[PDB]
Amino acid sequence: MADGGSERADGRIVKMEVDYSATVDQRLPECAKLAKEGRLQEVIETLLSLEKQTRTASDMVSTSRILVAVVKMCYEAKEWDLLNENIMLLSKRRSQLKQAVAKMVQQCCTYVEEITDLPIKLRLIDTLRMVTEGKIYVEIERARLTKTLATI
Amino acid sequence: TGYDLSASTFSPDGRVFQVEYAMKAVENSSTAIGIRCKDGVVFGVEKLVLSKLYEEGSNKRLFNVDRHVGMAVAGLLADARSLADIAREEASNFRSNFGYNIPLKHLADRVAMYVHAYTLYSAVRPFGCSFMLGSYSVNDGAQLYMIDPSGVSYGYWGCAIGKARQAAKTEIEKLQMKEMTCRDIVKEVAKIIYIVHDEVKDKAFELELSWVGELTNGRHEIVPKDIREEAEKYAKESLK
Amino acid sequence: SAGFDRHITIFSPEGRLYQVEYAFKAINQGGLTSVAVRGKDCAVIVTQKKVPDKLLDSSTVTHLFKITENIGCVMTGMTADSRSQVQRARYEAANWKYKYGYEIPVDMLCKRIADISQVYTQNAEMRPLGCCMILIGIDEEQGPQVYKCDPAGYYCGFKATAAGVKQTESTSFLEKKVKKKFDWTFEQTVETAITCLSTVLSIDFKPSEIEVGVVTVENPKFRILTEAEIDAHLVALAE
Amino acid sequence: NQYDNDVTVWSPQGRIHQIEYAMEAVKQGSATVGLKSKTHAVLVALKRAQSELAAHQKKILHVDNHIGISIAGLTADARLLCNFMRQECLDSRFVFDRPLPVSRLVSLIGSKTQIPTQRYGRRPYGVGLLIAGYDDMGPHIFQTCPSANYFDCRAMSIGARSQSARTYLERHMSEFMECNLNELVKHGLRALRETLPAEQDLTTKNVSIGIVGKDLEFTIYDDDDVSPFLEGLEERPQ
Amino acid sequence: GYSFSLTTFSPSGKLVQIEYALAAVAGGAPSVGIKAANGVVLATEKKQKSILYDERSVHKVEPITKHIGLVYSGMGPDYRVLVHRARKLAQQYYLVYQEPIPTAQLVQRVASVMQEYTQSGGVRPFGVSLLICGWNEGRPYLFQSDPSGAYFAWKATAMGKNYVNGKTFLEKRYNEDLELEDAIHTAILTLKESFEGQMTEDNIEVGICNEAGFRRLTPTEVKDYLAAIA
Amino acid sequence: TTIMAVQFDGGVVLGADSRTTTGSYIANRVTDKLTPIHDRIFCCRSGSAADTQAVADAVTYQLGFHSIELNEPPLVHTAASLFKEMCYRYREDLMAGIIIAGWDPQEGGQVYSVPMGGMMVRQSFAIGGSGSSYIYGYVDATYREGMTKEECLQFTANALALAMERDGSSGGVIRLAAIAESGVERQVLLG
């Protein structure tokens, strides 16, 4: 079902530089329409985590540079829109957004010795917006705590 | 319970049990189903023979209200006869005051408000009947309605009234009724009746199939199944 | 304690009477909730539907009822008592035009409805119609209005309105909602009318489970929203 | 027991007991048997004495020249329905100048008895009418009941201990369509003699036989003309 | 108890269901009415259960003719019946006599309407008491009907909840001769005795009688009247 | 009084004079002889003035109430039936010359005629009123099957003006109306 979205994501990671990264955001809403389907077993959470993994990996390549604003504006795009995307009335709070950003706060642990203090706290102030809502319940309950200790 | 005597009294939690008691009197009657195809409505009634002295066509439950409207009653049979005469009389005044046939959407509203009036006063009781209304037109297509003893009336694609109300609609909804013709429906109605308890713990029965749609040119009449007998020939092959 | 007047409509020693206030908990067997919102020059009804069967149709379910060309309503409570209440509303709206020669105000109609519900309390020997009615309409030199009629014969017009099962939870949301002085530009109205019902019921509904009636100063005809543009307002609030 | 008082009050089982009690008034009256052939419909009743020297109470009564009825149950509801029955028969003669079809006259009775089985203020009619008639499509045998249901049938017996009469009719109903009146009448009154205690016999003074025919007007024979019908009979196998 | 009904007596005393109907009057909203030397002042209490209720929709002080007003304390749904009765009844005098009906004449007739529902049995009495004002033939008037059918002529009174505190207030307060402007000052000051917390221009609703006819006050004056005048 | 109604392929065309007279004195000089009932159905009235105004209010009350229940636009034949049920019932009491015309989605343009008796009949074109007797020979020698809309407006303008030539119950000004699927175009013709 969603393996076509994986092999298209196999295309876009090659075409991060061959094609421009806005076209990765143009192939993105088709994978959102796949997440809009999300019915029972076909295109649901386990395969939805794969596009969520590959869209963050494309967000890694696009904003490894100092053009950081794309990974942040893609987040308030999708994390306000996921109420319209996957399942209405509090979707799952279960592997649909959690490890996609638990990887990213692990990346904020990596970049804090490399990137300077300004765009990483712009990165933190934009991830505090949805961490105040959910995603720090259990398992990685310290997705907030490993980065609010970083703010200290 | 106790405050359940009149139909004009409320319970301490807010419902009328006299309406609730009359609903499950319809439950004890035999199953009558209704279904509509894309160009017609097909009725069907499981009707059981009383002992033996029944004379093969008495006291039927497939009435004929208008030129294109009939009923598929179930419950107290005498109470349905008086209710059928109201719908015969209601459709006559619409002809005499407006000059054309009664729409089924307007006919079911006039009947259900009349059933509603017997659920308000302490002098009278609610009815003990539930029934079907099927019609066909060229400007409106086919419609199929449903009236409970309380008076709630709205439209279905298929229904059942009797003991097996749930046990019939389980296998009604596995039919592709949106595109079939109502000649293929007739051989499919007869197997729905014969699956669920035709004469298992009962004694005997006889099938009645009413019929309205494009092939009848808007007329409502019984099937010519007596001709070629194809309903029972096709449904009794479903023994295994 | 009770005893004394819990069968018929007479007084209780010092207090009130119970058969009318048993009709107030006769709405709640519908299992439904309706919300009306007046913020500015428009007016919005919103109500969910509950379809429990695939054989059951879609067109014959809607609780939005067009009374006149500029007056629409929504009905809660039990179903059969609701439609007979509408038949009186359609009837006496036409008597005003015949007797008096102009369109009836939405304020005047709830007087004529609640007075019919009044006689059934005063005089006995008829069950007092356990349903509730909410109206909207456009008035010249007065703007839009939202009215509610009660089974007791009470009526009052008010801005943000809830009914059905969840009054005390939805009105608690709308008191905190209508306290700031924000303008209501016809999508501020609808998005609050959705998200109030969406959080109190906790459904955040899929597009095909509701109804939305509307009226607006521009086109004063009563209008039921198309399923396509219901999706357009749903994708508007969740950008 | 509190639900067992009025016609209006439903039960928590869904059965109105006042209609169920008016069936019991039908079993108080005596037995009567009606049947029909292709051409002739004969109903036979059983009189009951009041005292040892009073006249026996009549059962079969003429209605129209093509309609005659039997009776079982209350005599108050008997003549009250008869006066409604005779009024409707002569209105079609006065207006339409035709005799009534038998099947649509009985539908007027079910509309007549439906109102006092729903509205408070009048009990249901305790009555057991058997109806024989001639429309344009041959003979008919009808029965009614105080639950306002009417049943078309080819043979029927109602009244006291009438179950034993029904067993005789079921194993001889194949013979009824062909035989003529010389035995069709005494096919019927062989069914009455099982609704009797086994020591007395159906005499000439306690039985009525009414015959309506295709070419025969409805005629009531009693107490003098029963003797050409009771001749040529066997006894009970005792 | 014997009661249960209206068409029979008790073995010792009086009709009990009319006494129970007066209990619903005491559980109503409070009200006050003061007859001054040049006019009569009516004032009542009107609080919504929420901030959502439009206050300018349903009114309490209700004119009958151009010189007669009327308030209540009981149930508002029963109040609207006998108001519409008193309107059409006041026009029947004017079609016959071509003269505005005096205030002592409605109370003969309105109490005879509330009389008639205390009959039969298959009916219930009202749960509303009234206060009727008006300035006919120079002298102003202030009356009070009840669900039993009797009536009065008050100098000053108060109905509704906590009426005994307002009565002992007015017994210590009301003198014989004041103007209408001093009368409203002691009519809000007795409403402050038993009101709730905030008292704005929308919590109260006040109508007056002059000799220039009946008038109810808009909230522009009532804000300016309650502005620091006690 | 002279009234006129002609149907065509799209819809119908109506027309009338004004000149409400009494004896030999004109009381009303310009008069709406055609009355809206629904958005697509008009009627033009003739006979007694107070009788036809009372009937047209009751039919608008009954038909306007009836279409809201069905949630459908009403039929033109439905409206013509309601005038028949009042004129035939209350005959020997009314003098009404009602002609009903209008567009309908099911059938298109229709013209019905209800004279002083109480009968109802569908026609292609219809005349009525006191001055209608003078143009009966002109209207059937000029009529032709298969006209357009602009021909029918030309047809009824010349047809009314011959009855409105001098005849004492007719003249004044011409009020025309065209009813189709799109809308209702009403105009006043003089000179």
Side-chain angles (χ1 to χ4, degrees), chain A, chain B residues 1-104 106-138 140-198 200 202 204-218 220-240, chain C residues 1-39 42-49 51-53 55-57 59-140 142-175 177-180 184-190 192-217 219-239, chain D residues 1-204 206-213 216-233 236-237, chain E residues 1-13 15-31 33-47 52-55 57-134 138 140-158 160-171 175-179 181-188 190 192-194 197 199-221 224-225 227-228 230, chain F:
Chain A
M1 185 66 204
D3 55 351
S6 180
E7 67 182 2
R8 287 180 184 91
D10 196 5
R12 292 296 187 187
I13 59 170
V14 178
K15 275 78 176 177
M16 291 304 294
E17 193 270 331
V18 178
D19 199 1
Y20 184 70
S21 67
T23 63
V24 181
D25 294 331
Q26 290 176 356
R27 189 177 285 177
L28 192 146
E30 287 84 1
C31 294
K33 289 180 181 178
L34 292 174
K36 286 177 182 178
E37 293 177 353
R39 280 85 53 87
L40 184 62
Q41 290 177 357
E42 293 292 327
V43 63
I44 205 164
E45 172 184 355
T46 61
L47 292 177
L48 290 177
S49 65
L50 290 180
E51 292 102 15
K52 261 61 182 297
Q53 184 177 2
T54 57
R55 70 182 290 165
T56 51
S58 67
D59 284 330
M60 284 298 296
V61 178
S62 66
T63 60
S64 64
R65 64 182 67 250
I66 62 170
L67 191 145
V68 185
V70 171
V71 67
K72 295 188 264 76
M73 70 178 71
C74 184
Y75 286 166
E76 291 100 15
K78 67 177 183 181
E79 296 166 351
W80 180 260
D81 193 72
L82 191 144
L83 281 76
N84 207 162
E85 285 288 329
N86 208 171
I87 293 99
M88 295 171 179
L89 191 268
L90 296 44
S91 155
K92 293 178 290 295
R93 197 182 176 183
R94 183 181 67 192
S95 296
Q96 60 182 356
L97 193 271
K98 189 178 263 78
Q99 71 274 15
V101 189
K103 182 175 72 69
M104 286 293 172
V105 298
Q106 183 59 255
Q107 294 299 322
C108 293
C109 183
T110 64
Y111 287 111
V112 70
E113 66 183 1
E114 190 271 331
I115 205 164
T116 184
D117 290 332
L118 182 62
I120 191 165
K121 67 179 179 290
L122 266 69
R123 177 70 186 89
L124 288 175
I125 199 66
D126 286 332
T127 191
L128 258 302
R129 299 294 180 89
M130 293 298 107
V131 163
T132 51
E133 190 271 331
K135 78 181 288 292
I136 45 94
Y137 185 75
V138 82
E139 170 32 29
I140 186 15
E141 65 182 0
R142 300 177 184 89
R144 183 180 296 177
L145 299 189
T146 194
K147 67 181 171 63
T148 193
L149 183 62
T151 59
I152 296 169
Chain B
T1 64
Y3 269 166
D4 61 350
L5 293 175
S6 176
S8 179
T9 62
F10 283 149
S11 66
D13 57 353
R15 66 184 185 272
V16 177
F17 293 103
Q18 289 289 319
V19 180
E20 295 291 328
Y21 290 161
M23 287 182 182
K24 63 185 178 66
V26 185
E27 182 67 28
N28 297 115
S29 178
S30 66
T31 302
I33 65 170
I35 191 67
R36 66 100 175 267
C37 70
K38 64 181 181 292
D39 54 352
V41 180
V42 174
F43 288 160
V45 173
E46 179 181 1
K47 180 179 176 180
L48 56 92
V49 178
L50 292 176
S51 178
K52 191 173 176 66
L53 297 172
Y54 183 79
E55 202 181 358
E56 196 179 3
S58 178
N59 63 10
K60 297 181 290 295
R61 291 182 290 173
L62 288 172
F63 289 154
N64 195 359
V65 171
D66 201 74
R67 184 73 185 90
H68 55 90
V69 175
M71 294 172 76
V73 302
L76 293 176
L77 183 61
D79 198 6
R81 295 182 186 274
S82 178
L83 194 274
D85 292 330
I86 302 299
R88 294 177 187 269
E89 193 269 336
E90 182 68 28
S92 296
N93 297 118
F94 187 80
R95 184 70 58 84
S96 67
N97 293 318
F98 297 96
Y100 65 101
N101 290 320
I102 181 68
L104 190 62
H106 189 273
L107 182 62
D109 291 332
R110 299 293 296 163
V111 176
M113 293 298 106
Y114 183 76
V115 178
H116 188 202
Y118 291 97
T119 63
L120 296 173
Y121 295 98
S122 65
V124 298
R125 71 173 187 264
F127 286 155
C129 296
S130 180
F131 62 95
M132 301 296 288
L133 291 175
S135 178
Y136 181 75
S137 177
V138 295
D140 291 330
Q143 292 84 17
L144 185 61
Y145 285 155
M146 175 63 195
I147 290 92
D148 56 354
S150 69
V152 180
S153 179
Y154 57 91
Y156 288 159
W157 285 282
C159 182
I161 299 168
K163 267 87 70 177
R165 183 179 64 84
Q166 295 178 357
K169 67 183 181 180
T170 303
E171 63 269 15
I172 292 169
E173 65 185 1
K174 58 169 65 67
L175 296 175
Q176 191 59 254
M177 63 189 73
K178 301 293 188 291
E179 292 85 5
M180 290 179 183
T181 63
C182 280
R183 188 176 64 247
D184 294 331
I185 296 299
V186 176
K187 67 181 178 66
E188 292 293 327
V189 172
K191 66 174 72 174
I192 307 302
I193 301 297
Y194 291 172
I195 284 170
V196 50
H197 194 277
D198 50 355
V200 177
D202 293 331
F205 62 96
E206 202 276 332
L207 183 62
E208 296 87 3
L209 298 172
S210 183
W211 183 55
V212 58
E214 193 270 332
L215 201 148
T216 65
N217 291 321
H220 190 199
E221 72 269 16
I222 199 167
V223 294
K225 186 25 53 244
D226 21 44
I227 301 299
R228 293 183 292 113
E229 206 257 333
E230 294 292 326
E232 294 86 3
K233 294 295 288 185
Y234 182 72
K236 289 182 175 66
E237 292 176 352
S238 66
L239 57 92
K240 64 182 181 293
Chain C
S1 66
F4 214 0
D5 53 338
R6 201 171 165 182
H7 295 90
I8 62 171
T9 63
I10 59 171
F11 290 99
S12 66
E14 304 97 25
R16 38 289 140 44
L17 53 92
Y18 291 91
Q19 290 292 320
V20 168
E21 67 182 1
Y22 288 163
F24 288 161
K25 63 179 70 66
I27 292 99
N28 291 320
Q29 287 87 17
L32 194 63
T33 302
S34 67
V35 173
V37 172
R38 193 269 304 273
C42 64
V44 175
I45 305 294
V46 59
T47 302
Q48 72 270 11
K49 69 173 74 65
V51 177
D53 193 4
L55 297 175
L56 195 149
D57 286 338
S59 67
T60 62
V61 191
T62 302
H63 294 87
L64 295 180
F65 290 147
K66 184 177 178 181
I67 300 299
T68 323
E69 294 293 328
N70 297 320
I71 294 170
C73 68
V74 67
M75 296 304 291
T76 59
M78 61 185 73
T79 303
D81 289 335
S82 65
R83 291 180 181 177
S84 295
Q85 186 62 256
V86 176
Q87 293 299 110
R88 297 295 301 274
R90 296 178 189 269
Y91 181 72
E92 293 181 353
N95 289 317
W96 187 272
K97 184 68 175 178
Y98 182 75
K99 292 180 182 180
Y100 295 147
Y102 63 97
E103 180 67 27
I104 185 166
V106 63
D107 188 75
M108 290 296 109
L109 196 146
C110 292
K111 292 176 70 176
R112 297 289 178 90
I113 295 299
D115 289 332
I116 301 301
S117 296
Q118 181 63 39
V119 181
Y120 298 158
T121 298
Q122 184 67 39
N123 193 2
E125 289 94 10
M126 186 165 173
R127 189 182 70 188
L129 291 175
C131 65
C132 181
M133 181 182 279
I134 299 170
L135 279 78
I136 46 96
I138 301 298
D139 194 3
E140 293 178 353
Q142 295 294 322
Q145 292 86 22
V146 175
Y147 290 99
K148 181 187 288 295
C149 183
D150 289 334
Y154 182 78
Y155 66 98
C156 181
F158 58 104
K159 299 180 288 292
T161 303
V165 175
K166 301 293 286 184
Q167 296 89 10
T168 63
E169 292 84 4
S170 178
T171 57
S172 66
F173 182 77
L174 293 173
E175 288 176 355
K177 183 62 68 178
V178 185
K179 191 182 287 185
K180 192 261 187 294
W184 296 92
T185 62
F186 182 74
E187 289 90 9
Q188 187 61 255
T189 62
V190 176
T192 57
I194 299 308
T195 54
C196 69
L197 184 144
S198 297
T199 57
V200 169
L201 291 176
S202 70
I203 300 296
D204 320 356
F205 54 86
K206 181 178 187 293
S208 68
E209 276 79 359
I210 55 100
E211 293 91 358
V212 171
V214 78
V215 73
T216 307
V217 202
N219 190 1
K221 299 293 183 181
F222 180 70
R223 184 176 181 270
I224 298 169
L225 268 69
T226 311
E227 179 65 28
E229 67 183 359
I230 288 170
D231 198 5
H233 292 287
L234 186 61
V235 301
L237 60 92
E239 293 90 2
Chain D
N1 55 0
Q2 68 272 16
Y3 299 100
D4 198 359
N5 288 317
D6 289 329
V7 186
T8 305
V9 178
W10 288 95
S11 296
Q13 294 178 356
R15 294 183 293 112
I16 304 168
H17 292 89
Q18 295 295 321
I19 285 94
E20 291 179 352
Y21 288 169
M23 290 292 178
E24 296 293 327
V26 181
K27 295 180 177 67
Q28 296 292 322
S30 70
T32 177
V33 175
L35 48 86
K36 66 180 181 180
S37 67
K38 296 185 295 295
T39 63
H40 290 87
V42 176
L43 57 89
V44 177
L46 182 65
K47 290 179 176 179
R48 182 181 292 117
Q50 182 61 256
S51 68
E52 287 82 2
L53 54 89
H56 293 176
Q57 184 66 42
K58 62 182 181 292
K59 296 285 185 177
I60 304 169
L61 58 92
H62 182 272
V63 174
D64 199 359
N65 296 116
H66 63 95
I67 289 172
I69 59 99
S70 178
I71 197 63
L74 291 173
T75 59
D77 294 331
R79 290 181 292 172
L80 192 145
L81 289 175
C82 180
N83 292 319
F84 180 73
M85 192 72 75
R86 298 185 189 280
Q87 184 60 255
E88 295 294 326
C89 291
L90 59 91
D91 287 332
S92 178
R93 301 294 297 162
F94 181 75
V95 174
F96 289 157
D97 201 0
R98 72 174 185 268
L100 281 170
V102 184
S103 66
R104 66 182 65 188
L105 178 59
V106 184
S107 66
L108 295 174
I109 302 300
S111 66
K112 179 67 171 64
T113 64
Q114 181 70 42
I115 281 102
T117 59
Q118 187 177 359
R119 292 180 179 184
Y120 181 74
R122 184 65 168 86
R123 68 183 185 273
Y125 293 164
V127 70
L129 292 170
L130 289 174
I131 298 168
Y134 277 94
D135 55 358
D136 290 332
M137 57 181 288
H140 296 285
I141 297 297
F142 290 153
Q143 64 170 349
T144 61
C145 69
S147 68
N149 297 115
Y150 61 95
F151 295 160
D152 188 6
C153 62
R154 63 181 65 87
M156 193 65 205
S157 179
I158 44 91
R161 63 178 65 88
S162 297
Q163 185 62 45
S164 67
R166 294 182 182 94
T167 62
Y168 182 77
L169 293 175
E170 291 179 353
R171 64 176 65 89
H172 291 90
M173 56 179 283
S174 66
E175 296 291 327
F176 288 164
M177 298 299 287
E178 296 292 327
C179 62
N180 55 3
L181 289 82
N182 199 4
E183 65 271 18
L184 184 67
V185 175
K186 70 182 178 65
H187 282 294
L189 54 90
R190 287 183 183 94
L192 278 78
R193 68 190 297 163
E194 295 90 7
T195 59
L196 296 173
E199 67 272 14
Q200 75 271 20
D201 191 75
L202 191 147
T203 63
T204 65
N206 54 0
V207 64
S208 294
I209 298 96
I211 299 100
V212 63
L216 182 60
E217 194 269 330
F218 178 73
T219 306
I220 298 169
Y221 300 102
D222 48 351
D223 296 331
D224 287 328
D225 296 332
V226 185
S227 297
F229 289 158
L230 291 178
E231 62 183 1
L233 271 70
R236 290 188 295 269
Chain E
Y2 234 69
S3 174
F4 288 102
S5 66
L6 188 61
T7 183
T8 184
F9 292 100
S10 68
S12 67
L15 271 298
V16 183
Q17 294 293 322
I18 305 170
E19 295 178 353
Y20 289 163
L22 295 174
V25 176
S31 177
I34 296 169
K35 188 260 185 181
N38 53 359
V40 181
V41 179
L42 293 178
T44 186
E45 186 268 336
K46 183 180 177 182
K47 283 181 70 68
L52 299 174
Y53 291 164
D54 193 2
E55 294 85 3
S57 66
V58 179
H59 296 286
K60 300 290 185 66
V61 171
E62 185 68 30
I64 302 300
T65 325
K66 65 181 72 174
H67 65 284
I68 291 165
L70 201 151
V71 294
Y72 71 101
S73 294
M75 53 184 72
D78 283 339
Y79 173 69
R80 292 182 291 112
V81 175
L82 49 87
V83 167
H84 180 75
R85 184 64 60 86
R87 295 282 181 82
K88 185 174 87 274
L89 186 144
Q91 297 294 322
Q92 293 179 358
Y93 187 85
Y94 184 74
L95 293 175
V96 175
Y97 295 96
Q98 297 294 322
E99 195 268 331
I101 179 168
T103 64
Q105 189 59 253
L106 285 82
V107 186
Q108 295 296 111
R109 295 179 184 270
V110 173
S112 68
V113 175
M114 300 176 74
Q115 179 70 251
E116 195 269 329
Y117 288 167
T118 64
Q119 235 359 59
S120 155
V123 297
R124 60 184 291 272
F126 290 105
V128 177
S129 69
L130 301 177
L131 293 173
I132 299 170
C133 61
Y141 295 98
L142 178 61
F143 292 166
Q144 175 177 1
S145 68
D146 58 354
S148 70
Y151 61 94
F152 298 105
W154 287 96
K155 293 184 184 294
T157 186
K161 290 183 186 293
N162 299 115
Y163 63 95
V164 291
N165 298 116
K167 184 63 66 68
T168 58
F169 184 78
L170 291 174
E171 191 270 331
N175 54 357
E176 194 271 330
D177 45 352
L178 287 175
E179 295 293 326
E181 292 85 4
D182 291 332
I184 310 165
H185 190 275
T186 181
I188 298 172
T190 184
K192 294 186 180 181
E193 182 69 29
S194 297
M199 290 181 69
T200 64
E201 64 181 0
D202 294 331
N203 297 116
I204 53 97
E205 197 262 325
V206 173
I208 59 169
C209 281
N210 290 318
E211 189 63 28
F214 180 73
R215 181 259 182 90
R216 63 182 296 275
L217 294 174
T218 63
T220 301
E221 293 88 6
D224 293 331
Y225 197 83
Chain F
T1 301
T2 302
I3 55 176
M4 191 69 201
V6 170
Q7 70 181 357
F8 63 97
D9 196 3
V12 297
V13 173
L14 280 77
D17 53 351
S18 66
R19 277 177 74 97
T20 299
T21 63
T22 171
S24 178
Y25 175 71
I26 286 93
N28 193 2
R29 286 83 184 271
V30 53
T31 303
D32 288 329
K33 296 296 290 182
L34 57 92
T35 302
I37 298 97
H38 197 266
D39 296 332
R40 298 290 182 182
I41 298 169
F42 286 176
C43 71
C44 55
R45 63 188 186 273
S46 294
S48 177
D51 290 333
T52 57
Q53 290 179 356
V55 175
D57 292 331
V59 176
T60 307
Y61 173 71
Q62 291 180 356
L63 185 66
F65 177 73
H66 186 267
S67 67
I68 304 299
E69 289 183 350
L70 294 181
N71 199 0
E72 291 179 353
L75 300 175
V76 180
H77 186 273
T78 302
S81 297
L82 294 176
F83 289 101
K84 183 176 71 67
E85 294 293 326
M86 293 179 70
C87 293
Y88 180 74
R89 182 178 177 87
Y90 294 98
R91 65 182 295 164
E92 296 291 329
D93 290 327
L94 301 177
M95 290 173 69
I98 308 299
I99 290 175
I100 300 98
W103 182 75
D104 183 71
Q106 182 68 41
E107 294 291 327
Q110 285 178 350
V111 172
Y112 292 97
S113 296
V114 180
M116 289 173 66
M119 61 175 283
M120 182 181 72
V121 64
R122 185 177 179 179
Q123 289 177 352
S124 297
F125 63 96
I127 62 171
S130 66
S132 65
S133 297
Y134 295 154
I135 61 170
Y136 182 75
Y138 179 74
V139 71
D140 52 353
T142 313
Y143 181 75
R144 181 180 60 83
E145 184 178 1
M147 290 181 182
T148 64
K149 183 175 74 175
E150 292 86 5
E151 293 179 354
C152 292
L153 271 72
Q154 186 64 42
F155 180 73
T156 62
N158 295 116
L160 288 174
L162 295 171
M164 291 168 64
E165 182 68 29
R166 191 53 62 187
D167 178 71
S169 297
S170 295
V173 73
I174 297 170
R175 287 183 178 272
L176 295 175
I179 298 170
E181 182 178 0
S182 296
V184 174
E185 293 180 353
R186 294 179 66 187
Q187 64 182 358
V188 176
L189 192 147
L190 58 93

